[PDB]
Design a protein around this ligand. Sequence first.
Ligand SMILES: [Zn+2]
Ligand SMILES: [Zn+2]
Ligand SMILES: [Zn+2]
Ligand SMILES: [Zn+2]
Ligand SMILES: [Zn+2]
Ligand SMILES: [Zn+2]
Lengths: 240, 240, 240, 240, 240, 240
Amino acid sequence: MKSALVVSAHSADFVWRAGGAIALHAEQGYAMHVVCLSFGERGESAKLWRKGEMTEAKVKDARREEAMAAAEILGASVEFFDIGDYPMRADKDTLFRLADVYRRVQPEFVLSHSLKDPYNYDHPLAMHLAQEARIIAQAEGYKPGEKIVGAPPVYAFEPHQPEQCEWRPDTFLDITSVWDKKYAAIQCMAGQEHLWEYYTRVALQRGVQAKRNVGITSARNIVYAEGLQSVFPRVTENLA
Amino acid sequence: MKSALVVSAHSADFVWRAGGAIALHAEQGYAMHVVCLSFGERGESAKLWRKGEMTEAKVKDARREEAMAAAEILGASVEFFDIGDYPMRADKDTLFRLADVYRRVQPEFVLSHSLKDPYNYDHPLAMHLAQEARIIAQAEGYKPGEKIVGAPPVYAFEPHQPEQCEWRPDTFLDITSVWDKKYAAIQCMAGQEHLWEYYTRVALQRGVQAKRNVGITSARNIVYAEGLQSVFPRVTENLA
Amino acid sequence: MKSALVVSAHSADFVWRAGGAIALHAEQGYAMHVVCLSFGERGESAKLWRKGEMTEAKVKDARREEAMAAAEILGASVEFFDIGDYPMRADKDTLFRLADVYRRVQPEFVLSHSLKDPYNYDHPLAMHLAQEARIIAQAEGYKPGEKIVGAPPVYAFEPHQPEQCEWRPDTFLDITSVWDKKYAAIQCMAGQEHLWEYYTRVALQRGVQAKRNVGITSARNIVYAEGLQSVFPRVTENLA
Amino acid sequence: MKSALVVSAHSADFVWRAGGAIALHAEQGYAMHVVCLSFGERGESAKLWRKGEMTEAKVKDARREEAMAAAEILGASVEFFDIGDYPMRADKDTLFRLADVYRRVQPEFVLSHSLKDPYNYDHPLAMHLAQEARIIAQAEGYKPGEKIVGAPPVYAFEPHQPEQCEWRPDTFLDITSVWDKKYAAIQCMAGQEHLWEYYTRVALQRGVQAKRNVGITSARNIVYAEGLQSVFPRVTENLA
Amino acid sequence: MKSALVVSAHSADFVWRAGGAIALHAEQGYAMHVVCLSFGERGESAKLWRKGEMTEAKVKDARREEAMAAAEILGASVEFFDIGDYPMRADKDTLFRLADVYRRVQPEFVLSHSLKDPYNYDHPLAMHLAQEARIIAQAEGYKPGEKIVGAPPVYAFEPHQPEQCEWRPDTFLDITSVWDKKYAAIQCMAGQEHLWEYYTRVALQRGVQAKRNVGITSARNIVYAEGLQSVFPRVTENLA
Amino acid sequence: MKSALVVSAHSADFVWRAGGAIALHAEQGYAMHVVCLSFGERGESAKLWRKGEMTEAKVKDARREEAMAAAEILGASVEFFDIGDYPMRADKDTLFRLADVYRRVQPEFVLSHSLKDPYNYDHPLAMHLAQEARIIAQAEGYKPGEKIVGAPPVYAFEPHQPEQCEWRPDTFLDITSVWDKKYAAIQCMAGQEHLWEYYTRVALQRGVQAKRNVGITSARNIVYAEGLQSVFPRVTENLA
Ligand SMILES: [Zn+2]
Ligand SMILES: [Zn+2]
Ligand SMILES: [Zn+2]
Ligand SMILES: [Zn+2]
Ligand SMILES: [Zn+2]
Ligand SMILES: [Zn+2]
């Protein structure tokens, strides 16, 4: 089956930043798989920590259930490496774990975080894991005999503060046809209504910009979009 | 009819740098049109100037005939603004001339030079003309009532010294199926065999790199490629 | 009196991009002055051109009245160089005209466009005029005997597509206290409701980002902000 | 009390690069705290190693006494993590140590090294520690119940070879009023007279440049300055 | 004796990327030394892994023999750290191992990989090791009493995809006089004829570009060149 | 004879920024030629404008005499295009004038201003003239029959605020042996003692940095240096 991979540093990230891309490609017949490296239990769970008698285990449970609910709505499978956030740290074993996901999923493309992020050190680490694991999975000397990975395009989805991250979308994905799914997944992020609104505005802004880049008087109905920054040059037979 | 536009600073440039793209899209049913802003009569015609009793008029004639022969082979139409090279200079009238080409051709995409070039000031000027004329042609206040231009992608094709020009190909066009046409067009560039060889090596190098970026063990037969740098973000519904 | 200057390529630009900054500093006792180099009569007036029997003179009249109405609401004075858009072109005389505005206004700071803009060549030209005129006005050899200009900070306000323009806000101006004025000025931009909504979303997005950069749990009520990119290093006695 | 933090890779760095900023803010009522991650015992102590029978313990003692003397003169407190230089290496525990300093000091701003430095790998590591520890200290899941850190601005002070480090000062701090203190602290750096002279020239050069950026004919008496590069966008209500 | 150092991530890299530089300086009386950090046994040995009953030990043996044969042809000595590729990882001990090579060889210059490489994470690690070990070897506190290293220039030799690596050659080394040696060394890379051809084309392309940068009508016979990117500013008494 | 060229936007610039390079190469047997495009009569002559009854003609006379005196001391010839400063503007004729200087001088290298300068628009214009005129002079179609120019290296000498200009010295010229000449030339810049001191400090700072880049314990006596940024890749047979 056609497949693709999302590598999310914290469990909520794939929902804010990749929900549209996931739902859209699922409807195109893709087996979308999400790896959440951590749950954002320490640094992306303020509401929970403000309740009494909170624990990391309790936070992880709440985050896990939200992610599974969102994944179901979007049409993706999801797994949890649970390696911890703030700080997130990985070793060779994390890397090989992720390379094995690549070997199993054989994704056509990969979505992860920007390589710079002055607001969150965990985010670029996730993308570095995603990229290096991809290359390990290409090596005929890694678990010899296994089917190797090819060269799936890798993209950074939109960070919270794109210019501060030196991130530029060179690719707009029109997610207008699946906005309802992305927003329903967004609503699984309990207690984070301000972010619901923020990422709604993001999709609308990128929607207008995407429309501008196909011609402002075009009849195409581009209302919601996700911006992506490509890691690799694309290969094509047509320049339109 | 489907159409596209190449803006060449000097008459030979579209052959070295865009021959593949022209021949490839022509076979896809595109009316490919080339504008040569000048003939490279002063700065790209050393062999001719080394003959006796040479004149700019004589050089232009030789360059014009070569370009027309190459265009015929590639399957493009070509016109000559004849505004002079070394130095190439343009005014509002040049700009409007080019905007009118846009309005007539209604291209789906545009190819021109890199925006930096420490070896040739004429080259970025050509691309600035191409880009600004494109925007003029978008304006409903420019020749009101005429059909406006949309937002065709613009690409810089490969300069002679790409790294010195700070140029990076983010797009590889597989021109393997039309290499014979590009090379036959190249052979119209009389007396420039060293450049024939140089741009053959360029296509082979980009071919290997393009192949690497689809997976080195892929069965795709990518032997010759042209590298392009995109000016604008592309809009799509699929990330593969 | 304390004063400051906005240099707008087209008459509507200072409203979308600087309305907050204008209204905010006016309330601080600044004589805010706006120069509109053109009216955007050819490239920023599509609605008007779609009416019958439209002329540039008629478009300019409509644009002029809108700008004057917006300026009144924001608390700024405004003048119109009327040098034409799409393409906007300037000569030494335009430059000296603007240098004379500097000499008269003696602004404490200047707002204008980003220095790159792949969607609009007029915009960077406006900022280059603003910057060079500022330097001319510094010269004791320019109209000797006149009081020279000092070194007012210069900022680029937010372009429509900030990342494509390689623009990063290094400064957020909290305009929460004057949002009603900016929005009322925005409503003077007749027939452009989609842009009303776009720049409302911009202010809300920058508002959230500005809040993030003072501490997400801070009691400061930062709801609407404008992002600016500084041209020059600032000089201070305190780093908080 | 108002407070601020300096993170110095080696014990002498805060004296050369931040002495002015420390003395200046101390006089403004700031409790200035300095963390020296190491003493520069192996790579910034050549004079000592040229004496006979030298040891790292002896070097550290000499460096510690100098730093304490300088801190006293500048009006700062100082602590020593003693994690070793050339190479400096940190782990999660170093990170948490520093996050605890943040939680205790609650600094209004942070000064540390440039993020690139081809002459000293320890320097960017110090700044990465400073930045990541700051973010850990923001997390309500890190030592839950403790008062979290907000968003204090972070600045890179001037490296020895600023252009090679790709460092640009976007902020000049006028330290004219405390130059005598900075220079007295500098003189605690025993045997390093060439560096005394170098960083005197640095302050004078930045002084002239800062003066240029407030207007060369301004009456402001800016003689000595420190240049800083900001990590985050600042938030303000005034653009002068 | 005059000496210089090449730090190669995988055993084959110094042959493709530095063979010319090695052979050329050897003929100038340099003791050229190569450190191969790994053999590229897992990620640069596909042909071998496609044979039956292959092992990492067997791959390393084959790679070692090739490297020794190439080194002999080029006129260099070579040693093998054998720390493993895909992923290559280093610790303080690797670093000190390399610093000791510096102390022993006292190289006049160093060649290693580009600092970015989206196709191979091992490559920048090698260059970071090379650079940091160089600085450790400068420290009078590292193995006190030993002769320290000065400031040998460091260069990144050409990566497979230079623009994707953001690599620009600021230095061309004319290797025309030793091309036969480089190519004979290249032929030791058994079964990799496509790469023989690729790096032949690279040398020819850089040859043409180097010739262009000394004057296209110069009598200098520059046919084969290697491109290098310098890490540090060079110091000279002549600007020709 | 060996020769080289300096293109100075204003008459004083070659003294502050290139005096060392001029004196040093003159002693190596170079015929050093300086073109001053203007006298800096309007924007670099404040002291004169503060006297009574000043005129541009009077300022130009004073500037001309200073430049001629400095040139004599440094060992260069100098000519004055007198095209005006603040604003400096050039046309095709200026360009051809400069190309003719190239054809006559046949320089081995060229020194001019940085390509960015937010403090002075005239400076980059001078460098653009220098670069484009160089290329015109290469063209066998420009004044056919004349001896063409080859590919002399072009360098930007140090601007007043290097980091704000995004300028990095990749080349340090040791001018220790001619500092007395540069300083004597500097003293011809009547009434500008603050700049005498500034550019003395610049040379001392670059001197220390150049020394650092040959090894801090080297016996080389590098006290005064000029920093240069190269436009083109250099071609060499040795990497030390
Ligand atoms: Zn996250
Ligand atoms: Zn050309
Ligand atoms: Zn506009
Ligand atoms: Zn240090
Ligand atoms: Zn390798
Ligand atoms: Zn000047």
